[PDB]
Design a protein around this ligand. Structure first.
Ligand SMILES: *C/C=C1/C(=C/c2[nH]c(/C=C3[NH+]=C(/C=C4\NC(=O)C(C=C)=C4C)C(C)=C\3CCC(=O)O)c(CCC(=O)O)c2C)NC(=O)[C@@H]1C
Ligand SMILES: *C/C=C1/C(=C/c2[nH]c(/C=C3[NH+]=C(/C=C4\NC(=O)C(C=C)=C4C)C(C)=C\3CCC(=O)O)c(CCC(=O)O)c2C)NC(=O)[C@H]1C
Lengths: 304, 298
């Protein structure tokens, strides 16, 4: 059990469905980039170092980024000017270790946002009058399946020894069930659980991805590798990826359930084939999770 | 008496929309609002017993029909009139062995973003009064009503304005107490199971229901769940004296009890679409949850 020792927070690489920049808070000069940016901008990664990021954004997007930093914000629409035309992205901004990390994801694509809001609203209301826990958990899982389209959503609860059990499940036809199944504690080891307590949402749209390294993997203010703890594109442990290969599910997304600053459980979402869920859909899942979290407590207290 | 007026059976609607009562079976018209004569250019009596599909486009009729199969509202409906098609938001309710169908004007992206951020600001509300202000201001940003108020009831069913957000030179009602007779018992009860209401123009002339009869069970048509229900003259009177010509309120229900109301007032007449009202209700619903989270900061 070297399981718990792998330093998952500093992998020096990202999942390539998105792009990452470290930029300075002053004039927003680039201090590191993911190597896959070469395909975006058609230039060697090294050559972007210390270049103002605004050179590759539209004026409106430059303005919008600058306002976001120097003054609720995520995601921010950013348009990148590339040699092969202007490309539109969801910009995901954060500050950690004296630096600013910008990540560029694909945008939200729904033709059905009003329906989306309605479903989230009726789910929150239902969750709030759930009379027992498996009912509350199942309302959560089924709404999450509604808005993600993933094949199988599970609510996984931790025992005192950090093993866990699937206590609720909603899945599409054909898909095998893991309901009531028990899993060993080493499947979600100690450093992962610590990270998931402070960073409650993660997605792996394609478990077969080729990691794209950071160039360079150095924090410009503090030295050392770039801490990707709070980054949405952080490359994930190869050992977990291999676990998922054996599971037969090639997209994964999970949301933490956190009670008393402690991991109570996870909403785990699997898909057979690779699949992306937009930032805004992930924020909706997190909302659902947070209401579920409150109701877990209401139910626990009602017994005692 | 305030609490004795049967506000749920006025036998008339607000004329910014149209009401049809139809049968559960083959959707033949059992009653219409009198103003449907302006839409279809026939009298109500000529409409009675005609399948409502007769006045809908083929696709509109197909959607209406599947809605009554089995999360449905609003249904887009295009109606066939002498003067061409008109598109509508169809709001369908099913009760008392009849179907009520109401047509409203349809909607109209910055919009979708602004609901998302409102909710994200509520998710990180520091305290209960701040959460209420946020809901007030975000409701005001998306509705465009001149003044929004979070109004909380007391033990004795009287209440006060605990939060507010308003435009330049609209009067403030912050911290003002009002008596329980202002929202009387039969109202509070309705508003506990029917959470949103809008009056786009205080001074509307009601359009009567023709005929005002439930065809399966007898009696006045129960409009409890109707979005176009005509409201109490006594309340209209009061809004006229307040000097405000549009209102819209959303209920806050905690523990199967009315906890409070979000009240939105405009100086002039002002409709907003089913979709924005639904957005505001989402906001009310997130605020509701948060009231419990922030209250338990104790
Ligand atoms: C003897 C009876 C009445 C009386 C009756 C009455 N009121 C209402 C509906 C009300 N009243 C409301 C009151 C307020 N709006 C505010 O902004 C504030 C305070 C800041 C108050 C106290 C509200 C919000 C409603 C709901 C509709 C809306 O949002 O405007 C009704 C029922 C109307 C209906 O048909 O549903 C009735 C019968 N009002 C009196 O003043 C008098 C004592
Ligand atoms: C010796 C190390 C091992 C190991 C490490 C490992 N696992 C994770 C992350 C996750 N593991 C999860 C397990 C489950 N998913 C399920 O659906 C179920 C049961 C139904 C289980 C038990 C989950 C959910 C995660 C979170 C990611 C996701 O949602 O898929 C990590 C951390 C990965 C990272 O963030 O970098 C690590 C290091 N897993 C093992 O099985 C042993 C070999």
């Amino acid at each position: 059990t070297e399981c718990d020792r792998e330093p998952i927070h500093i992998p020096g690489a990202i999942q390539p469905h998105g792009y990452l920049f470290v930029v300075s808070e002053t004039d927003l000069r680039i201090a590191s980039v993911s190597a896959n940016v070469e395909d975006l901008l058609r230039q060697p990664p090294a050559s972007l170092l210390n270049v103002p990021i605004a050179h590759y954004l539209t004026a409106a997007s430059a303005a919008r980024l600058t306002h976001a930093l120097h003054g609720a914000i995520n995601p921010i629409r950013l348009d990148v000017v590339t040699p092969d035309g202007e490309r539109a992205f969801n910009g995901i901004l954060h500050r950690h270790d004296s630096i600013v990390i910008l990540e560029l994801e694909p945008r939200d694509e729904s033709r059905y946002t009003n329906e989306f809001f309605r479903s989230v609203r009726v789910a929150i209301r239902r969750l709030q009058t759930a009379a027992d826990l498996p009912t509350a958990c199942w309302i959560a899982a089924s709404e999450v399946r509604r808005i993600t389209g993933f094949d199988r959503i599970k609510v996984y609860q931790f025992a005192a020894d950090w093993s866990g059990q699937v206590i609720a499940e909603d899945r599409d036809s054909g898909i095998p069930s893991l309901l009531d199944f028990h899993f060993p504690s080493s499947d979600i080891p100690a450093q992962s659980r610590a990270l998931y307590t402070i960073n409650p949402v993660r997605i792996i749209p394609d478990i077969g991805y080729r990691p794209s390294p950071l160039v360079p993997d150095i924090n410009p203010r503090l030295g050392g590798p770039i801490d990707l703890s709070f980054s949405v594109l952080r490359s994930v442990s190869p050992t977990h990826l291999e676990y998922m290969v054996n599971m037969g599910m090639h997209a994964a997304m999970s949301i933490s359930i956190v009670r008393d600053n402690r991991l109570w459980g996870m909403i785990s979402c699997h898909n057979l084939t690779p699949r992306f869920v937009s930032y805004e859909v992930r924020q909706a899942c997190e909302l659902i999770a947070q209401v579920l979290t409150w109701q877990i407590g209401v139910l626990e207290e009602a017994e005692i």
